[PDB]
Amino acid sequence: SNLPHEPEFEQAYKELASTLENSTLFQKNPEYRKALAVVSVPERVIQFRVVWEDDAGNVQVNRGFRVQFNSALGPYKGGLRFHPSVNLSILKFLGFEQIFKNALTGLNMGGGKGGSDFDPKGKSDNEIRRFCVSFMTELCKHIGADTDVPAGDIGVTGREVGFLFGQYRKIRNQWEGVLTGKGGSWGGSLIRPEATGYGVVYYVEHMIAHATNGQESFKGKRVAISGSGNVAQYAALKVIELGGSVVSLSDSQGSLIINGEGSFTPEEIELIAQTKVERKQLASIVGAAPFSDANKFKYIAGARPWVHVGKVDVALPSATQNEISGEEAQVLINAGCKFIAEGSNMGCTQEAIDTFEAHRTANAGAAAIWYAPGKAANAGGVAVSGLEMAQNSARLSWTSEEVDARLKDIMRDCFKNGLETAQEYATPAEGVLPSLVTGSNIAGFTKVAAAMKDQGDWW
Amino acid sequence: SNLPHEPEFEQAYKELASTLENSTLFQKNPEYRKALAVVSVPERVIQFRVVWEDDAGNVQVNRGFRVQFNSALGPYKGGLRFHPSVNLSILKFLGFEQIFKNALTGLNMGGGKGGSDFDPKGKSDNEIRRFCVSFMTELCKHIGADTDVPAGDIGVTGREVGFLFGQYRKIRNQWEGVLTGKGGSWGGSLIRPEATGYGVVYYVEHMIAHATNGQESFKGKRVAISGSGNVAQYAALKVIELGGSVVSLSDSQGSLIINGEGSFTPEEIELIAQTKVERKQLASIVGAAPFSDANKFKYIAGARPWVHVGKVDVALPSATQNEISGEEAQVLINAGCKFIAEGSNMGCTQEAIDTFEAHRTANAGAAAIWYAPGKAANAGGVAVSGLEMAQNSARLSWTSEEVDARLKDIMRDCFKNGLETAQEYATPAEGVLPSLVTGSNIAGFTKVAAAMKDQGDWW
Amino acid sequence: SNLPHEPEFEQAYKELASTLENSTLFQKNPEYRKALAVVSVPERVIQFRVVWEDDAGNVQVNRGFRVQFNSALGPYKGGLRFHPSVNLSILKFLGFEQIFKNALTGLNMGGGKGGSDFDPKGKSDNEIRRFCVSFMTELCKHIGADTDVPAGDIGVTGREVGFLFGQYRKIRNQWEGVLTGKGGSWGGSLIRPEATGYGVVYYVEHMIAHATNGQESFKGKRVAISGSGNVAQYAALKVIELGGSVVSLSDSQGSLIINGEGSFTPEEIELIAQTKVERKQLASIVGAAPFSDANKFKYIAGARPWVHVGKVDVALPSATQNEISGEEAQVLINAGCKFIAEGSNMGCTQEAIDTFEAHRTANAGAAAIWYAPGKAANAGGVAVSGLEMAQNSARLSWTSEEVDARLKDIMRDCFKNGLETAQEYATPAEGVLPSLVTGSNIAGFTKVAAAMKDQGDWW
Ligand SMILES: NC(=O)c1ccc[n+]([C@@H]2O[C@H](COP(=O)([O-])OP(=O)(O)OC[C@H]3O[C@@H](n4cnc5c(N)ncnc54)[C@H](OP(=O)(O)O)[C@@H]3O)[C@@H](O)[C@H]2O)c1
Ligand SMILES: NC(=O)c1ccc[n+]([C@@H]2O[C@H](COP(=O)([O-])OP(=O)(O)OC[C@H]3O[C@@H](n4cnc5c(N)ncnc54)[C@H](OP(=O)(O)O)[C@@H]3O)[C@@H](O)[C@H]2O)c1
Ligand SMILES: NC(=O)c1ccc[n+]([C@@H]2O[C@H](COP(=O)([O-])OP(=O)(O)OC[C@H]3O[C@@H](n4cnc5c(N)ncnc54)[C@H](OP(=O)(O)O)[C@@H]3O)[C@@H](O)[C@H]2O)c1
Ligand SMILES: *OC(*)(*)(*)(=O)[C][C](*)C(*)(*)(=[N])[C@](*)([O])=O*
Ligand SMILES: *OC(*)(*)(*)(=O)[C][C](*)C(*)(*)(=[N])[C@](*)([O])=O*
Ligand SMILES: *OC(*)(*)(*)(=O)[C][C](*)C(*)(*)(=[N])[C@](*)([O])=O*
Structure with a gap:
């Protein structure tokens, strides 16, 4: 093992696990303990450097992430968070929760989450645009309408969805439901x-x-x-x-x-x-x-x-x-x-x-x-x-x-x-x-x- | 030519051809004789070795097939048969029949059939799982939601569809209608x-x-x-x-x-x-x-x-x-x-x-x-x-x-x-x-x- | 930021950075400080669940990784480590070091490293085979002869290279130099x-x-x-x-x-x-x-x-x-x-x-x-x-x-x-x-x- 400390993820996992234990679930289906061990390790995680240019022409570096936690029920689905707190621990708690949330909707959606430690506060709209362009230049390799469908979350609104969608369409040369929270006309x-x-x-x-x-x-x-x-x-x-x-x-x-x-x-x-x-x-x-x-x-x-x-x-x-x-x-x-x-x-x-x-x-x-x-x-x-x-x-x-x-x-x-x-x-x-x-x-x-x-x- | 003997296929072909001849079809449209000659040669057939591991750790070998007979009306569509009788002759009779059956539904579905000489009888569920995993490792190159959509048939139930779907999703990284006969939640x-x-x-x-x-x-x-x-x-x-x-x-x-x-x-x-x-x-x-x-x-x-x-x-x-x-x-x-x-x-x-x-x-x-x-x-x-x-x-x-x-x-x-x-x-x-x-x-x-x-x- | 503690990586980074500072490099080229900040964030990291079957038929779960650190000088290049200590910190220290090592060879090779917390000790050769098969089923999406070329390292010998190569060839349907440390005849x-x-x-x-x-x-x-x-x-x-x-x-x-x-x-x-x-x-x-x-x-x-x-x-x-x-x-x-x-x-x-x-x-x-x-x-x-x-x-x-x-x-x-x-x-x-x-x-x-x-x- 030698696993890193991921407090947010551990918190979410522990609360789920505790509620399962405090029930008759594992009396009826003790084999679900195995399911819990497997489901709690994400199917895939992509992390990537995001280099972008600020309004003064300086090179800026942030970290990008997409946690593709579970796809049993459908393609990976969940938002993107742009907040300076963002790390793998946080995105794993969110992606884990997303699996079970999505299950409760009755729709075919797997669980994922992503984002960046990029802080939209204090940035110009132009800076947000350049960041979203760089971010999606890498993320577009890993997502798609039948693969992984992101959306907004903290720090990601319709504005950012638009810049992200635009760059995806440009590289992938496909116009499809790769993101949700899209604008009315597109x-x-x-x-x-x-x-x-x-x-x-x-x-x-x-x-x-x-x-x-x-x-x-x-x-x-x-x-x-x-x-x-x-x-x-x-x-x-x-x-x-x-x-x-x-x-x-x-x-x-x-x-x-x-x-x-x-x-x-x-x-x-x-x-x-x-x-x-x-x-x-x-x-x-x-x-x-x-x-x-x-x-x-x-x-x-x-x-x-x-x-x-x-x-x-x-x-x-x-x-x-x-x-x-x-x-x-x-x-x-x-x-x-x-x-x-x-x-x-x-x-x-x-x-x-x-x-x-x-x-x-x-x-x-x-x-x-x-x-x-x-x-x-x-x-x-x-x-x-x-x-x-x-x-x-x-x-x-x-x-x-x-x-x-x-x-x-x-x-x-x-x-x-x-x-x-x-x-x-x-x-x-x-x-x-x-x-x-x-x-x-x-x-x-x-x-x-x-x-x-x-x-x-x-x- | 130098064509192999395919009795089941020949039987299906002869019965179709006889009924067409015993009608006014070729009086009205004698050019349909050409159509019959073309339609009766499959567009594509894939055959492949399937190596899988039994519960004792021994190497087992079976033969896998997918006959992609006709795609005029839609993507290839038809089941998978796991039965020790399976061979190309049998799958061609089935795939040929499937073309015309699918035409009668009014839906856009071409005709195909596939499967293996793997015999599910006497196998453990674990053995069936390992077989389906190996089988789909190759088959997934040739099928897809807008290409070829298999399903069950003799020896292929919802259990096998599940193991097949799982392996497809894992390799292809797409969650889509590549198989039918899928489970209620997926x-x-x-x-x-x-x-x-x-x-x-x-x-x-x-x-x-x-x-x-x-x-x-x-x-x-x-x-x-x-x-x-x-x-x-x-x-x-x-x-x-x-x-x-x-x-x-x-x-x-x-x-x-x-x-x-x-x-x-x-x-x-x-x-x-x-x-x-x-x-x-x-x-x-x-x-x-x-x-x-x-x-x-x-x-x-x-x-x-x-x-x-x-x-x-x-x-x-x-x-x-x-x-x-x-x-x-x-x-x-x-x-x-x-x-x-x-x-x-x-x-x-x-x-x-x-x-x-x-x-x-x-x-x-x-x-x-x-x-x-x-x-x-x-x-x-x-x-x-x-x-x-x-x-x-x-x-x-x-x-x-x-x-x-x-x-x-x-x-x-x-x-x-x-x-x-x-x-x-x-x-x-x-x-x-x-x-x-x-x-x-x-x-x-x-x-x-x-x-x-x-x-x-x-x- | 909110970055995790990665002691091995931090150690490697600090020693490199210290030697650069204790020289005339940044007097001549102070702009290289920017280069250091950028190079030290990996271009891409893939992490993935590896489910595999042991000799008793039980489901086992390990963690897989590939750190694709830098590709300026060539496709990503570096080994795979199978050792119970393995985590992202360790693989980042190794991948970071690999960038500069590869630069010293005079050949066009970028820097990467990967592996798993799978422990080969106490496993049968059959278990190692099943693990390598599952591992490469996911890894093969991310590597290739002009993209990323792994090899052995601690716990990965010619035996494991062989099982890995075999599975890559099976899925990708290409026979190429995707791995090194390969056997004499292949x-x-x-x-x-x-x-x-x-x-x-x-x-x-x-x-x-x-x-x-x-x-x-x-x-x-x-x-x-x-x-x-x-x-x-x-x-x-x-x-x-x-x-x-x-x-x-x-x-x-x-x-x-x-x-x-x-x-x-x-x-x-x-x-x-x-x-x-x-x-x-x-x-x-x-x-x-x-x-x-x-x-x-x-x-x-x-x-x-x-x-x-x-x-x-x-x-x-x-x-x-x-x-x-x-x-x-x-x-x-x-x-x-x-x-x-x-x-x-x-x-x-x-x-x-x-x-x-x-x-x-x-x-x-x-x-x-x-x-x-x-x-x-x-x-x-x-x-x-x-x-x-x-x-x-x-x-x-x-x-x-x-x-x-x-x-x-x-x-x-x-x-x-x-x-x-x-x-x-x-x-x-x-x-x-x-x-x-x-x-x-x-x-x-x-x-x-x-x-x-x-x-x-x-x-
Ligand atoms: N959007 C969705 O569809 C969706 C769906 C399900 C759940 N959620 C969850 O709902 C919550 C809100 O998301 P949202 O879409 O409304 O985001 P949003 O539009 O960015 O708003 C987030 C709000 O929360 C505040 N906030 C964010 N991080 C904070 C922190 N670390 N400490 C204190 N305050 C903080 C923000 O303050 P500032 O204004 O100071 O920036 C802002 O008022 C999140 O937990 C999100 O994951 C969202
Ligand atoms: N499933 C579909 O949606 C579908 C659609 C259209 C047509 N069909 C056709 O319907 C028939 C039955 O398929 P199914 O889906 O019901 O399959 P299934 O669930 O596997 O059942 C097949 C049944 O037929 C018996 N059988 C199979 N091969 C035999 C053989 N060579 N000799 C004697 N008995 C044999 C089986 O006996 P054992 O129990 O001894 O194994 C079993 O009772 C097939 O001709 C199939 O192609 C199926
Ligand atoms: N192979 C290459 O081409 C290559 C190239 C450059 C550098 N390196 C580096 O050279 C070193 C050795 O690699 P290798 O290819 O020789 O690996 P290897 O064949 O697996 O041998 C590793 C040796 O080191 C011991 N060892 C491994 N981890 C240990 C730990 N945590 N504590 C104590 N002892 C440990 C092993 O002990 P046990 O026998 O008890 O398992 C074994 O004797 C590594 O640092 C590797 O990254 C390798
Ligand atoms: O995919 C989405 O619409 C995500 C919604 C959301 N931000 C959530 O569920 O946390
Ligand atoms: O694609 C299918 O649903 C196949 C159904 C079937 N087994 C048949 O028509 O023979
Ligand atoms: O790609 C390789 O040959 C890796 C060699 C090695 N294990 C190293 O440099 O650490």
Whole structure:
């Protein structure tokens, strides 16, 4: 062996493995232990130097990656992250999670992830273009519409997807669904920008309906969100549409919180969206209207929103991994939070998860805080990417209503699958909510493990 | 020339050619003689050594084949056979037949067939895995989703399809519809397991309705089936569903016959299915319940079912080529059999066909035994494979009801095409049933010949 | 950034960088600092899961790697290591070193390295075969005669090269010089087995001639060697041929030392070679003749040879990285050792190198211990691999005398280049031997950096 330390990956692996062990899965199918050992080593990883030219004519060097984790269920599928933290450990945690998330969508998509330690912050659009051109010059050897289909993630938006697609088409001389999150006129899907955030909210609608026996909904609930990028923006918009209140957003430098009762409006979210297109911080817009209104908004530098929002009903971490600590989880519980779903991949620390799950086991019915893992709740994005692939393969574009209806059905089925799987393999005490994390993990893992066995990846 | 003796291929060719000559086709289009000469030489054949390792560590050698017969109408399409009889002659008869069968489906599929003289009987699942891995290591150079799309046949089930698909994906680094008969979670189609047997029964429903002017159906009819694999199992299930009685199944070692009035049940077929998954003989299950009940079941070693079932209304040979002799055909006629359709490819000997066709010409209307050739009646399997290809290209999965409805429409159109083509080119005496073998052959051949001419394969 | 800890790679990088800084190179060409930053990030790295079947039928999982570090001077070139220590850090140190080593040969070869954490010890030949088959099934996508040409290294012999070549030819359907160290009848080169060890000794012949003004040679010198594989065996044979005494060999479990005056003989080396073919330890042969003769041989469990050989004139570490500690370096100096050359890649710890170099600076002429780095002294192996590539591209085989003559010329030129480059850029005090490590590093680095600039890798 002599294996390197990969803490993020180890964290994701340990949480999956623990939930599988804490169930009857390996009593019924002890041979799945072998499947777990095999699935946890990626099929392929490509790492590559990316040399690019800055606006001053200087040579810059970054590291590029694509983790092609598992392809039993379909071609490798998952986003690209451009963030200075990026390394193999991080991309492996993401790619591993992606395998099981993709399994929960019901579409034929394997799991992968890639990106670079290139930091889009402080770069010109021209610099981003030159970087994407160099990056894809190498990546295009390894991907393709029936091989590996990337998309965005942190630091990769429609702008970067465009520069990447352009360079792929130029070298490969094929116009195909090699990327998703593409633009409307060049093979994009309606609802793809909305999909992840909408899906998180759709999934939580099912959680609320089940836990409260149809008595409550998002109508009148206070929802704390973190991040202010793609997932946070559209989760906020859907909450607002359903009559809920969005009481926080955040970024890497601080939190922007609603002061008292009230909500972000669609118009305010659009202004924040335009700020983030320009790669600027929330801190840069709080000096002018409307965000300078200290009666509506409180900007807190260096803080996450969880301890500053007061009473809340729903928390949707939608920024990055490990953004809810164990302490923060306890404060959310103390604030009356009954629903927590990950928009962000591995948004909760392990301490947070353990806190939420202990609370669920100790508190009957609607009194419990119910935790839904990202692989279930944030699967709407990759699901709609699958639909974008389907549209590109049909050579036709579907309506917003058609894509959105399918997204709703996928999120419903994903919730049902996790709920019913937990009821079957990790049956809770009477009156206790089944574990959506355990259920989702078992449901995704078994589907992958069985397909791997069929295909001779293990025996 | 100096051509080798290929008896099976020569048989299939001669029967097609004879039916074309015994019609007005070459009076109207004498240039189609040229088309016949060209179509009868395969576009490409690949043969290859397959070295594989047995459970004792010993080197084993088998022969692999893929016959890519014709691609005018679409990429090459047809199954893989693993049986110790396999050779080029056999695979050419099958691939030749496949061209015209595929033409009758209305889908864009060319004709091919392949396989190996590897005998799955007596092998471990591990040995089957190692064999499929070695086999596909070579075959993957020659096939692909827009080139050649294999599937199962005798000795190749979903298990083997899985091992084959896995190895293809590993080498080719593409996840695509390169095989059909795939598993549910990795690009399979609902109704594909059922398709061939269901389709045979659907086709015969049309034969019964036409011959009897709507007065009879499968309800209350006695149906003798041979084989006990994929085609026989599902043909039996559909018969049962329509209110018919299944009075025989068989395998390579003997026949299992219903003793008197009665039928196999769905539960019994499932037990036989599980036996065949384990690659065991019917002889191995007649020593225990329910098949040890000598009042319901008679096991006859070394026999085909035809002379042992007594009176029957419908015969569906569903095992292998040349499994109804001339003598057996006469006994079926003497037993009151009025409908005979091939589930198996070239199930009837030429003597049998001649006997059935002479009887049709000598006996008006419903008094005739009506013979339907495999290229018409068993086309449901490859049709649903085409639909599996369509689903994989759409990147979506259809419902059981959707696939089954399309299968029903395809079988109806295939019957109508053969019936109407025979009425046009080989017009029977008044009151005489048109020849479905002649009609089907002309309809499939002309479609292929005309497409070949358009594409410059002949002029 | 967020880069992982890669100690071996960092060690190799730091030693190169330090020698470049401790010279006039960056005074003359400060722009080469940019070249250093670019060259130190590999062009491409492929990592992949390797699933293989053991003799009991169980699924085994190992990790495979190919580091394609630099291709300015030619296609990527360097060995494969199968050892349980293997990871990316180790393969990056090796691949980095390979760039500059290959530059010193005068042949068009870029730098790479690969392998697996698969441990050949305790495996059957059948298990090694199945592993090599699985390994190359993936690796063959990334390599080729004009792309990347691997070879052996620790744990990869002609046996493994054969299984690897066979699988490549099977999938890729090309017979070409994709590997070196091939067998005599299937594209191997005479002198390739000998090349690394012979070359180390040839290089040291030049060191001795220069330091002693032609007065001494290997004739009558005592030479301590470590390892007992390919490099150690043939270095020992060449020493013996030149009239030197070989006074030690070793393996991972202990050292086999000559007791007093005397030498290993060719016959004894052949017996050790046959033992190592069988993957057995030196410990397993000391219980029988000739190695049980305690008057000729002392086996010391758990020891390296350096402190146990007494007085020695030349040390040739030929096993593995970091196998001469700082303390061991001082004992060799105290034992009269005047020449130390690395057969093994990064054989000396940094402490050892610093000790040897301090001694050289403090002691005039022949009184100094003279250290030659592996990139200079062990380059004969990869040089003869280049010649094997040349022979395969010519489609002809050269004589032993032709290959050996070219190897001698390459080792002479490599020595001259390092010596003269050190005299130019790191001029020693009068009477002090120039630094072969500094000279070799500058000569290899500048050639690569300049070719990279020409090709637009940096500007
Ligand atoms: N996009 C998708 O379809 C999709 C699908 C499923 C899951 N996800 C997950 O959802 C999360 C958000 O992704 P996104 O697509 O919304 O990305 P995005 O548009 O780049 O937004 C990321 C947001 O999170 C913040 N953030 C990122 N890294 C951070 C760090 N290390 N510390 C603190 N804050 C950080 C950003 O702050 P700054 O504004 O300061 O840069 C920004 O507000 C990620 O975990 C992602 O993997 C995304
Ligand atoms: N599967 C398809 O979709 C498809 C489509 C169209 C036509 N067909 C045709 O349908 C027939 C049956 O195929 P299948 O898919 O059902 O195969 P299968 O599942 O392997 O079953 C074949 C059955 O036929 C018996 N059999 C095979 N070779 C024989 C021989 N040489 N002598 C006596 N009995 C033999 C087998 O006996 P044992 O059990 O003793 O092995 C078994 O009961 C074949 O002619 C095939 O080409 C198949
Ligand atoms: N082969 C080439 O052409 C070539 C060219 C240039 C440089 N090199 C370098 O030369 C050195 C030897 O390679 P080789 O081709 O001779 O390999 P080899 O035939 O496998 O022999 C390696 C020898 O070193 C010992 N060894 C390996 N790893 C060890 C460890 N971690 N600790 C202690 N002892 C260890 C082995 O002991 P066991 O017998 O106990 O296994 C064996 O005696 C390596 O540094 C290699 O990279 C090789
Ligand atoms: O492929 C995709 O659409 C990726 C979506 C995403 N960034 C995720 O699931 O983490
Ligand atoms: O391609 C297929 O689905 C083949 C079906 C079959 N075995 C046949 O038509 O003979
Ligand atoms: O490519 C080769 O011949 C590699 C030789 C070697 N193992 C080295 O230089 O480390």
